[PDB]
């Protein structure tokens, strides 16, 4: 309830962007950057409890994989935006 749940939910947050229309560039972009920054502080915050061991713990791999998902979710949107041929969204 200190690292895994915040790590799991920020991964869920990044996947809310997939259900938003591709034309909402600011909204989906803030989704990506906010989760990535949130994932960064969680990774930095997580290590603070235990010593400065060189190797990587099981928490580190879970945080690393969750970093891949949130980061891949933003690269996914950049790919989606690359093929967005029109700026205006659906109306009516």
């Amino acid at each position: 309830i200190q690292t895994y749940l915040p790590c799991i939910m920020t991964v869920i947050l990044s996947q809310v962007s997939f259900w938003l229309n591709r034309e909402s560039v600011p909204a989906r972009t803030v989704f990506g950057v906010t989760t990535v920054l949130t994932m960064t502080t969680l990774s930095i915050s997580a290590r603070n409890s235990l010593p400065k061991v060189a190797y990587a713990t099981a928490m580190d791999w879970f945080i690393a994989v969750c970093y891949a998902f949130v980061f891949s979710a933003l690269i996914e949107f950049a790919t989606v935006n690359y093929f967005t041929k029109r700026g205006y969204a659906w109306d009516g």
Binding site: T29, G32, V33, L37, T40, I44, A54, Y67, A78
Partner: protein, 333 residues
């Protein structure tokens, strides 16, 4: 119990009329004192306080003719409280900030008399010794922390030091497992430091500590590398998306200065610029130039070729950053 009574008489004679105020061979040649350490552990290697904590079994061996006995064939290990009735060298660690002899279950000392007069005197000491660290290449740095064993009141005319066993006097260094340091080398020196009060013997035990970089990739470099890569995403968004690119821009810039500020507070307030500062400051330029890249894009348009600046920047930024890493990592590693 007959042998116990015999030992009692012998040990009683040695302390009878024993002048604790006078060293062995007082008024005569210097007494040679032999030392051998057993490093139990090294902990709290702190650069905020510029010190390291050292736990060791610190043995001293010297000859004292007054404590010579011949009747008993065995070597006498006596209760540690006898040390208060015996002359012992007044050795101190010059760079020691805070030290103590372990106290439970009793005073962690040893007194062992040998028939020829030799006295083996051991203590279990935990000393926080001062180690001034050159953090210029931190965290890719090698530190050289030392322990300066020296006699306080007795000059070289009254006492001498030597590593008992020479290069085999200190043990346990290989077993010591620091979390963020690898003890690459250790050396033993015998000096003669001169003060205004005379010249004194000096034993210096230096450990060369090499820092492990694996921890700092996890918490320091990779978060800054990923944020730098994140800022390059803005080069893939069309120029007219001002809120998206600017929000991507400032957030990367502001987080980067936050990471730099957050880390440097955990360290002491050294004036110079470390290696982690060089990388974080170097990656601050790319993220800041990434934001200025959009500002030029916005200015050139509202103030075909606009894509070219957005297209060439699409590749040179990951290229120039890689070369910066090649120069940085090659230079420091």
């Amino acid at each position: 119990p007959s042998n116990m009574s015999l030992v009692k008489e012998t040990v009683d004679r040695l302390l009878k009329g024993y002048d604790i105020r006078l060293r062995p061979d007082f008024g005569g040649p210097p007494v040679a004192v032999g030392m051998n350490i057993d490093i139990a552990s090294i902990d709290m290697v702190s650069e905020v306080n510029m010190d390291y904590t050292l736990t060791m079994y610190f043995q001293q061996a010297w000859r004292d003719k007054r404590l010579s006995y011949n009747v008993i064939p065995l070597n006498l290990t006596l209760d540690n409280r006898v040390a208060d009735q015996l002359w012992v060298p007044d050795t101190y660690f010059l760079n020691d900030k805070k030290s103590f002899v372990h106290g439970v279950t009793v005073k962690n000392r040893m007194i062992r008399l040998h028939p020829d007069g030799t006295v083996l005197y051991g203590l279990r000491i935990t000393t926080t010794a001062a180690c001034m660290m050159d953090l210029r290449r931190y965290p890719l740095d090698e530190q050289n922390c030392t322990l300066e064993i020296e006699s306080y009141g007795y000059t070289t005319d009254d006492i001498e030091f030597y590593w008992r066993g020479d290069d085999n006097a200190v043990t346990g260094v290989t077993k010591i497992e620091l979390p963020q340091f690898s003890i690459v080398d250790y050396k033993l020196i015998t000096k003669k430091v001169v003060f205004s009060t005379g010249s004194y013997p000096r034993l210096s035990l230096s450990f060369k500590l090499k820092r492990n970089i694996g921890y700092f990739i996890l918490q320091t470099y990779m978060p800054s590398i990923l944020i730098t890569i994140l800022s390059w995403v803005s080069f893939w968004i069309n120029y007219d998306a001002s809120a998206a690119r600017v929000a991507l821009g400032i957030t990367t810039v502001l987080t980067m200065t936050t990471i730099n500020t957050h880390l440097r507070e955990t360290l002491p307030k050294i004036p110079y610029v470390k290696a982690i500062d060089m990388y974080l400051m170097g990656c601050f330029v790319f993220v800041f130039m990434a934001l200025l890249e959009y500002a030029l894009v916005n200015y050139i348009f509202f103030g075909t070729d606009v894509n070219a600046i957005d297209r060439w920047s699409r590749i040179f930024f990951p290229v120039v950053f890689s070369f910066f890493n090649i120069v940085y990592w090659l230079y420091y590693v």
